[PDB]
Design an enzyme around this catalytic site. Sequence first.
Site, PDB file in Angstrom:
ATOM      1  N   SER B 200      -0.375   2.748   6.838  1.00  0.00           N
ATOM      2  CA  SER B 200      -0.321   4.137   6.346  1.00  0.00           C
ATOM      3  C   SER B 200      -1.680   4.876   6.320  1.00  0.00           C
ATOM      4  O   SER B 200      -2.373   4.951   7.333  1.00  0.00           O
ATOM      5  CB  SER B 200       0.386   4.180   4.976  1.00  0.00           C
ATOM      6  OG  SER B 200       0.342   5.459   4.347  1.00  0.00           O
ATOM      7  N   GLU B 324      10.946   4.698   8.736  1.00  0.00           N
ATOM      8  CA  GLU B 324       9.747   5.182   8.057  1.00  0.00           C
ATOM      9  C   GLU B 324      10.007   6.175   6.922  1.00  0.00           C
ATOM     10  O   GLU B 324       9.819   5.850   5.741  1.00  0.00           O
ATOM     11  CB  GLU B 324       8.759   5.802   9.050  1.00  0.00           C
ATOM     12  CG  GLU B 324       8.255   4.860  10.143  1.00  0.00           C
ATOM     13  CD  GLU B 324       6.960   4.138   9.800  1.00  0.00           C
ATOM     14  OE1 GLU B 324       6.366   4.405   8.737  1.00  0.00           O
ATOM     15  OE2 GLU B 324       6.522   3.296  10.608  1.00  0.00           O
ATOM     16  N   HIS B 437       8.583   2.216   4.674  1.00  0.00           N
ATOM     17  CA  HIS B 437       7.134   2.299   4.838  1.00  0.00           C
ATOM     18  C   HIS B 437       6.425   1.190   4.064  1.00  0.00           C
ATOM     19  O   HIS B 437       6.635   1.046   2.861  1.00  0.00           O
ATOM     20  CB  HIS B 437       6.670   3.655   4.289  1.00  0.00           C
ATOM     21  CG  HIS B 437       5.390   4.166   4.871  1.00  0.00           C
ATOM     22  ND1 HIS B 437       5.031   3.970   6.189  1.00  0.00           N
ATOM     23  CD2 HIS B 437       4.414   4.935   4.327  1.00  0.00           C
ATOM     24  CE1 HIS B 437       3.893   4.599   6.434  1.00  0.00           C
ATOM     25  NE2 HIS B 437       3.499   5.194   5.321  1.00  0.00           N
TER      26      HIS B 437
END
EC number: 3.1.1.7
Lengths: 533, 533, 61, 61
Positions: B200, B324, B437
């Site tokens: 990320s 995601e 995520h």
Amino acid sequence: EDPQLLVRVRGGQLRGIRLKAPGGPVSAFLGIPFAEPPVGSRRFMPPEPKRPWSGVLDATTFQNVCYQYVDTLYPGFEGTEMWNPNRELSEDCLYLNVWTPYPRPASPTPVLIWIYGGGFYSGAASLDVYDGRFLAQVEGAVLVSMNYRVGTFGFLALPGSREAPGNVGLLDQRLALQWVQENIAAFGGDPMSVTLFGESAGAASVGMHILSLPSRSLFHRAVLQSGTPNGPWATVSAGEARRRATLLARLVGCNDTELIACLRTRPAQDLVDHEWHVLPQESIFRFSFVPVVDGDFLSDTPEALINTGDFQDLQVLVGVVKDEGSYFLVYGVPGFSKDNESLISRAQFLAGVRIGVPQASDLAAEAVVLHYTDWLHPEDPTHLRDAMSAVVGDHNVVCPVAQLAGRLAAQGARVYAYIFEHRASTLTWPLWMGVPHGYEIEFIFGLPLDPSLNYTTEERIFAQRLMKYWTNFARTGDPNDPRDSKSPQWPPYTTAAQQYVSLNLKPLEVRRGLRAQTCAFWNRFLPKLLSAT
Amino acid sequence: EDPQLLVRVRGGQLRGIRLKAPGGPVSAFLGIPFAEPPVGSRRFMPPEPKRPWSGVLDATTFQNVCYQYVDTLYPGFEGTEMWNPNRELSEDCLYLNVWTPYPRPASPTPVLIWIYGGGFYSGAASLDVYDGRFLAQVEGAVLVSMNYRVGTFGFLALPGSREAPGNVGLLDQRLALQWVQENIAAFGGDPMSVTLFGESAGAASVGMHILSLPSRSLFHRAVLQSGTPNGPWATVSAGEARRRATLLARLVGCNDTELIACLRTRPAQDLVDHEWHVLPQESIFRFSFVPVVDGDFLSDTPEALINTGDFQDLQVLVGVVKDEGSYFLVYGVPGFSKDNESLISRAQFLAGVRIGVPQASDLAAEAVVLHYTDWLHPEDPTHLRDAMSAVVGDHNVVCPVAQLAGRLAAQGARVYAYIFEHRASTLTWPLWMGVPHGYEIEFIFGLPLDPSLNYTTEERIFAQRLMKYWTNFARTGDPNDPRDSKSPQWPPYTTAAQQYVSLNLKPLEVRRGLRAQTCAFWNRFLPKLLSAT
Amino acid sequence: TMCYSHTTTSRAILTNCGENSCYRKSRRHPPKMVLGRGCGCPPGDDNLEVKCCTSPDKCNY
Amino acid sequence: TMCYSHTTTSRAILTNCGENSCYRKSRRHPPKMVLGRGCGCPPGDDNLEVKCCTSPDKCNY
Ligand SMILES: *[C@@H]1O[C@H](CO)[C@@H](O)[C@H](O)[C@H]1NC(C)=O
Ligand SMILES: *[C@@H]1O[C@H](CO)[C@@H](O)[C@H](O)[C@H]1NC(C)=O
């Protein structure tokens, strides 16, 4: 939400909460902000009032606790921990609480403002011991308690500088006094009957208040429990205050305003971490940041003021707990421990004196030992242990108390003295500590009155009587009941006869001269010797 | 204390600790400070190295966690909380940790520096998931992980000002890179084999690093897990950064240096409290303080740089997790909840698009709905739910990933792409969220390797293989085993064929074109439409 | 090993230090105030003593 | 009543609020971030919703 716990105060509306006492409902207004949060560039500055708010302010609970140090000397030990803060620490901490019976009477009631103690480096009205719950419900009194800034934040001073004038800690509390003088009425609070009482450093503040005119006029009576404005620990010279601040400033990583400037960029945690290091000589009952003689709040030393101020119009209650000095011995006086009798030797007793009376040079130290050693039994550990505790109690509390009381009675003020001699059945400290510093508050506040709390019937009936004394004083000045009274009347400490009573499970027993001899030494001789060395 | 966990580093000696992995001893050096505590008047400034210390520095544990925000969306919920800091918050937080096998080899070993993710407002290497314990013991690699300043502190910028230049958060991490380039050797760490990998916001930093020359030269390879330097969330114009800072400044209670000056007097708690308010439009996956194009660190936008930089000499691993965008829907996109299927209506799906793609004006919003609505089933809640998550995943991660990968493969860099498709058997989130995520890190790090931890044999043998891929890349560039290999070889993402593999319990299955169509829309069309509206 | 953990502003919490030494940072000269305990064994200065133990639990009392 | 308590920098602790209302201070517009829960029921602003409950435990979830 909609009963009669709604109040309009000069700044907005507030909604209190109904707390149930063992004897019935109570109206508690916990959380009332009385000044703009002294954070950012308002730290080290004097308080500023709270700008009015819109709508209704929630007041169902306690606010923050002024950033401070947590004593962790005894992890898990009730005695020690019962004094630790019980709310998040924050500089945004200036809020007072109010207590009134349910429902608030139409008849104006005597107000009792309580200033917490904590050696000027700790404390919080948020504490359970300071629960106005009972004193309000049972006695029908209106209690109050602010949160003054303590520590680095509350007293760092660079005298003769507008950025950090010092004594601001006292200023906050003064403000709370005013908020009362212009709001307490709305709680059925008599704006005349204000009776501010305190313990230790707090008790010193009260004294500090009846010495500065600006403050004086905001209250009528006054009580001092185990502390005085004139002791050797509650004041510092404009020079010494100025010394420590600069030292700390350097310790941290920091031109007066510039010095301050850097200080304001520095973290509360950072500042707290470093306050115990500006302390000059190894000692006990000696705190690093306390009120300073700025020649503004305290125009001259507490002593001079006490020595000449007009007091005929003031009622005062001043007292001492039996074993004062015991508490602090465990903080570094060789031999002492709460985990044993702490039977000290004449070898250690000698070092003991050096620490306890840290400003005294050699010869004076000799003067102390002479006075406290029993020459027919100079090495008896027991006597030596007790005598060690005695030097601390007398030097710091009792003697200076006896002194304030003396000088005050001469200037016409109504003075009542006492010595609380009851060791609670719930104490956690060893037997050898006796009735330590602060272990009366538990009773003054009425805690034993709560049937869930463990205590003894005697203690309960006892706490009730004590409560009466305090309130009675707050309601009139004479701590005695009318015709309906336990006849052993409490005699006003007159300079000449020096009488005072004893507070314990047994009825008022009068005695004359509070430590007459030992104090004559301390208060009278010792000074002169010191000036000579 | 006296084994071989003592090391001299260019600044002093340090004593590590022997941590036991499931397969044997490990040498962990937790806590190494690499810069002067950026507190007081050093906040908002770039890092400054750690002045040398005397004696031996304890290094048996993790240090502070950079002051930050704690997400409390789901009290007690594993999924959410597993990301919360696990150490006291403090600005005094810049310390890196190091891990080496027991005993540290004479033979130089490939180094893996891990940059934590956390949307630039949270994160800590101190977290359990980032346990270098296994990757070192089992694979025989030397891992590292700094703590960069995040949030207000790490990225507030008033561009073209020496007090708060911005991007300082990145600067700290750069420093840790240098400390490695001039110390890691002493741990048996090959100063060449440095392979920085991230997830990320962290993964975005890596990218951020291979774009700024000063940084570039401190590492050799690079990995980007679910994040890119070129996304719509990781960068802000020198003007917008300058807008938010000033806004916050005003929010708090605060002439550039003057603005900063006041900011430095203001409390970390105070600043944290107010960062989520400088955010302009209601949106999700949109963070308030992230790297800014200062035209110094990032001389121009990530896009331009990516568009022209020479890359033939760089090996890169870039990838995406299956679902995601799912994670962020629960943060305020109507209809969604982790406590139900979150079956949305076409009514809400419309608002969904407005939020998820917050910079797009009406017409573009139309363009999105068209593209994602199934006109033969326009109101099917299921499809609509999934499509909603799809707009977020593509818009933010996948498409920009596919783009970086594309532009990079053209400029000669060795690129390998993948899509991790395994939902752990221990996930706490609902089934509809898929493989959210950050839910691969658990495996990349080898956590399943710890027999105390609950998982499945398949997952264990799986995690082992993944570990190999990463290390293999870090050790050579090709994420494949030699002759001794699971023959389905991983094909380098070539612009022309666009191949990449799938990571899951089954053997490498190659596929062509990563979201070719949808991305063409996003990466190619959408921009133009936006410029036109 | 179970030890106590706290700064100068925290309550005494009990944190498992695993197989490691835990400390007690206190002021050297009276008043010997406690300035915090934790795992590990850090270097003190003349301003503060740092006692370090290894066994048993609560040994860093 | 048992409720959750925390600032924007604290973990969700459970504090007995006795017979009182406890809150949940969250951001009004997306992202609807939680800015802290506690006892009492304070006034919010357009920037942040404040839900207040009374029963049962953990109602200020
Ligand atoms: C009491 O305990 C303290 C601290 O452990 C110690 O210094 C002293 O020697 C012990 N014994 C006596 C008689 O005080
Ligand atoms: C799911 O839960 C959320 C939050 O409680 C709610 O808004 C929504 O209506 C619920 N039902 C569906 C089908 O998402």
